[PDB]
Design an enzyme around this catalytic site. Structure first.
Site, PDB file in Angstrom:
ATOM      1  N   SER A  40     -40.663  24.886  25.896  1.00 36.70           N
ATOM      2  CA  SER A  40     -41.760  24.515  24.980  1.00 36.70           C
ATOM      3  C   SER A  40     -42.732  25.231  25.375  1.00 36.70           C
ATOM      4  CB  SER A  40     -42.200  22.954  25.380  1.00 36.70           C
ATOM      5  OG  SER A  40     -41.087  22.198  25.447  1.00 36.70           O
ATOM      6  N   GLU A 138     -33.923  24.284  18.509  1.00 34.92           N
ATOM      7  CA  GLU A 138     -32.784  25.112  19.129  1.00 34.92           C
ATOM      8  C   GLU A 138     -32.778  25.885  20.343  1.00 34.92           C
ATOM      9  OE1 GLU A 138     -33.777  25.534  15.524  1.00 34.92           O
ATOM     10  OE2 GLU A 138     -32.671  23.482  15.269  1.00 34.92           O
TER      11      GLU A 138
END
Length: 261
Positions: A40, A138
């Site tokens: 992230s 993904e």
């Protein structure tokens, strides 16, 4: 360093750390040039890319972005709330950085030409390591040895320094990036947990959810002392190996201590 090997061993994986004192030029470096999944954390550099583009394009940040329900992938808390009204480029950036909103990150990636567009931006500031290959979520496979969607603790630290403290962004955009990172709500148990409370800190976390892969990078403004830029990344060999925010905070404490901070 010995403490670092000890730490990762107890962790059951690898820990990569790079921290630099922007004043003395001193650095802490352990597995700093090794590749670790960004998870992230790419979202922080994604917002910078947006700010950088807003320089040559006024009106960008206030540009309204309408999206549909199909766009609300897992962990899109902000995007979900503003679905019926949409969000501006600036609001999506704040959401992506401070809440790690995936929907928002994907809409911004689309605006920058996707993962390749962001990779190209990192190239323009001189980052030759960073590479984003896929979109959320993904990009979180974190398969051992896989170079997709990875960077080095060192490259991340250097780029963060250029963008927040250096001159990779015009003065205004520079301060906006700092303010968005300062307002992050997801990293209280990572780097932020390693520093005092009077210290101004900005950060962006990354959590892949597999292979004990988690991370965090930040710029810490010590009281009376120059700011420190650091990156702490982890990973493990087993898909079910869990990440640990405590390990990240511990590694960050060692980095700071190593700098006598």
């Amino acid at each position: 360093a010995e403490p670092f090997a000890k730490l990762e061993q107890d962790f059951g994986g690898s820990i990569g750390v790079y921290a630099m004192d922007t004043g003395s030029g001193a650095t802490v470096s352990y597995r700093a040039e090794e590749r670790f999944p960004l998870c992230s954390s790419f979202k922080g550099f994604l917002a910078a890319a947006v700010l950088a583009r807003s320089q040559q394009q006024a009106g960008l940040l206030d540009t309204p972005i309408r999206y549909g329900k199909n766009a609300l992938v897992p962990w899109s808390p902000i995007s979900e709330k503003y679905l019926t009204t949409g969000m501006t480029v600036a609001e999506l950036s704040a959401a992506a950085v401070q809440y790690s909103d995936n929907a928002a990150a994907n809409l911004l990636l689309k605006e920058l030409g996707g993962p390749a567009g962001l990779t190209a931006f990192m190239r323009s500031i001189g980052d030759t390591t960073f590479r984003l290959d896929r979109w959320e979520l993904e990009l979180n496979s974190a398969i051992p040895g896989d170079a997709r969607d990875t960077s080095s603790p060192r490259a991340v630290t250097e780029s963060l320094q250029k963008l927040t403290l250096g001159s990779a962004l015009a003065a205004p955009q520079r301060q906006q990036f700092v303010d968005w990172l300062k307002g992050n709500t997801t990293g209280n148990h990572r780097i932020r947990a390693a520093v005092p409370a009077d210290w101004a800190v900005g950060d962006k976390t990354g959590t892949c959810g597999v292979y004990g892969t988690a991370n965090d990078y930040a710029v810490v403004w010590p009281t009376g002392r120059a700011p420190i830029v650091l990156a702490v990344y982890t990973r493990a060999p087993n898909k079910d190996d869990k990440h640990s925010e405590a390990v990240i905070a511990a590694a960050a404490r060692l980095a700071l201590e190593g700098l006598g901070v």
